[PDB]
């Protein structure tokens, strides 16, 4: 499982370089792109020249050109490399990835920083294992890496570049800081006194105490002359660890069912109609109480041939509360088929019996109340309140986290109110991007309500946890950056 053929820092010049001099046909490799940021460019070499393929992504999906709408790059590299073709009918081969040695995307690589800062966050938030690689200053051009062990302590070494490679002054010498790390986490070193300098797992310097969000927020959003770009960058990269089996989606008999062909659930949280098969997983979020912890259901938006499965899982997973963060129609697409009947009306969705009690309207969302029932049965029926919200925009992410919290802290306060009430189900378009965003934010804000301001949050591990669960939950930097400021938001209204 690797990552490595997708280079951070590269422009379309540097790439087609690469391609043409360390690469040979069949080659690839993918990088931002540059002319229109936000969007990803997929550069592959065919018969001696270099083709740049462009992925965009406005919140909901990668979208290839030419090709199909993917959740992740991984999931799209992996999908092609076991037919893309050109919009002139040629055939492309992504054969050989082409490595990316910039090791900025790293979880243990730290830039330029500083031997004290080093040592107080090795001190403050280290254990045994903890390592990091920071850019050395007084031997310009070297690095250096510093592992605590332990009573406790902690050893510094030295990197040193020679000729494009690097060792630890003797041994192997590698052709990237990458595969210097990788060698000495299986092979660690041993001081002649015995002391085993084991690589366990990097420093975490993401996460931080619920009150200082502003602070943490200013740092990230600082200029170079971002911290954002880093953190999330290097959340990307981890996506690779996360290509957990599709089977049932993939059934030919399921087709059908799936509003986006390669936007599959995972087999192993998907859940399953007790025939079977619907887009959707749970997502049940796990930490490191006397309350009932709230779960969710990420899912698709409905399909015409889905609707009676939809309801079949509300009804089954005893769900009460429904979130829709997206309109039947958008820029004349269809991305949600109308699941609940006309205000006052009674509908019949197969063997489910819903009835639209009541239509209560806000500016930025609508909600419905819903009693869902089995046909032919008495004692089954229940409320399920729908919300339709409304007003997010076409692309990107709202300017301000205002509705969309007033939003989510109502939709907090009536699963509260239910006792029993099953997970939370929260759908969109593809189900990954603003699904995604919403689940995240309503996680994060759900610790800070049980353990108040003074709390520690971590929001990449939070969405990597998240996105084990169904695949490419939060889509892009702009949501990531939303997030972050909806927490920061939240807090300044207590
Ligand atoms: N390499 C970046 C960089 C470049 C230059 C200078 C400094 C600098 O620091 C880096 C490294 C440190 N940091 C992190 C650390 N971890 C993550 C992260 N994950 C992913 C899933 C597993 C996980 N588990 C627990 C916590 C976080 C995470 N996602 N994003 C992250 N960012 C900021 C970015």
Not at 334 to 362: F, H, I, Q, T
Not at 375 to 399: I, K, M
Request: aromatic content about 10%; proline content about 3%.
């Amino acid at each position: 499982t690797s990552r490595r053929w997708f280079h951070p820092n590269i422009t379309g010049v540097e790439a087609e370089n690469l391609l043409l001099t360390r690469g040979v046909d069949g080659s690839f490799l993918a990088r931002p792109s540059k002319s229109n940021p936000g969007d990803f460019t997929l550069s592959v070499r065919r018969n001696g020249a270099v083709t740049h393929i462009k992925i965009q992504n406005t919140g909901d999906y990668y979208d290839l050109y030419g090709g199909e709408k993917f959740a992740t790059l991984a999931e799209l590299v992996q999908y092609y490399m076991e037919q893309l073709k050109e919009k002139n009918g040629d055939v492309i081969e992504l054969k050989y990835p082409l490595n990316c040695a910039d090791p900025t995307s790293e979880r243990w690589f730290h830039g330029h920083l500083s031997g004290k800062e080093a040592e107080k966050l090795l001190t403050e938030k280290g254990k045994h294992g903890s390592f990091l690689v920071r850019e050395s200053q007084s031997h310009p051009g070297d690095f250096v890496l510093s592992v605590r062990t332990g009573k406790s302590k902690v050893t510094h070494v030295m990197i040193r570049c020679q000729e494009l490679k690097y060792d630890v002054g003797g041994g192997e010498r590698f052709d990237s800081l990458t595969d210097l790390v990788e060698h000495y986490k299986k092979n660690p070193m041993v001081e002649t006194l015995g002391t085993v300098l084991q690589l366990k797992q990097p420093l975490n310097t993401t996460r931080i105490n619920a009150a200082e969000i502003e602070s943490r927020v200013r740092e990230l959003s600082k200029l170079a002359e971002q911290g954002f770009w880093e953190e999330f960058e290097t959340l990307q990269q981890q996506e690779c660890k996360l290509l957990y089996s599709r089977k049932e989606g993939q059934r030919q008999e399921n087709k059908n069912k799936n509003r986006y062909k390669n936007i599959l659930p995972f087999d192993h949280t998907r859940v399953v109609l007790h025939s079977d098969y619907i887009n959707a997983n749970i997502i049940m979020p796990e930490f490191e109480n006397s309350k009932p912890k709230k779960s969710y259901i990420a899912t698709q938006g409905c399909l015409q041939n889905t609707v009676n499965d939809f309801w079949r899982m509300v009804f089954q997973e005893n769900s009460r509360v429904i979130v829709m963060t997206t309109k039947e129609v958008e820029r004349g697409k269809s991305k949600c088929v109308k699941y609940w009947p006309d205000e006052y009306a009674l509908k019949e969705y197969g063997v489910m019996r819903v009835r639209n009690v009541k239509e209560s309207a806000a500016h930025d969302y609508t909600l419905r109340e819903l009693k869902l029932s089995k046909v032919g049965q008495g004692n089954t029926e229940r409320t399920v309140w729908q919300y339709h919200f409304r007003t997010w925009p076409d692309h990107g992410v709202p300017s301000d986290p205002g509705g969309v919290l007033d939003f989510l802290e109502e939709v907090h306060h009536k699963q509260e109110s239910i006792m029993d009430a099953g997970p939370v189900v929260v759908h969109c378009s593809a189900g990954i991007g603003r699904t995604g965003t919403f689940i995240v934010i309503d996680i994060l804000i759900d610790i800070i309500r049980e353990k108040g301001v003074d709390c520690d949050i971590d929001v990449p591990k939070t969405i990597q946890m998240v996105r084990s669960q169904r695949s490419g939950m939060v889509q892009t930097e702009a949501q990531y950056r939303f997030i972050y400021m909806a927490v920061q938001h939240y807090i300044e209204t207590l």
